[PDB]
Amino acid sequence: AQAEIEAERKRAREELRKQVAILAVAGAEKIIERSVDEAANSDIVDKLVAE
């Protein structure tokens, strides 16, 4: 019984962690949309085109 309860705790904690992770990454996407511009685009390109 205690093993089953511990497994349920672990499962639910992972489930809620994944929900809030979804929320966080979606917020990050909107932040990128609200902040990116040509200067940042060129900075990213110059970090990329080295390889």
Partner 1 sequence: DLDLAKASATDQLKKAKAEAQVIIEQANKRRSQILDEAKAEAEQERTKIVAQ
CB of 14 to partner 1, least distance (A): 19
Give CA–CA dist 26/43, Å, rounded.
23
Q: Toward partner 1, which CB reaches closer, 4 or 33?
A: 4
**Residues in 2-41 that interact with partner 1 by CB under 8 A:** 4-5
The secondary structure of residue 1, as a DSSP letter, is -
Q: Which amino acid is at 40?
A: A
CB of 3 to partner 1, least distance (A): 10
Q: How many CA atoms lie within 13 A of 36 on its CB side?
A: 11
Positions that interact with partner 1 (CB under 8 A): 1, 4-5
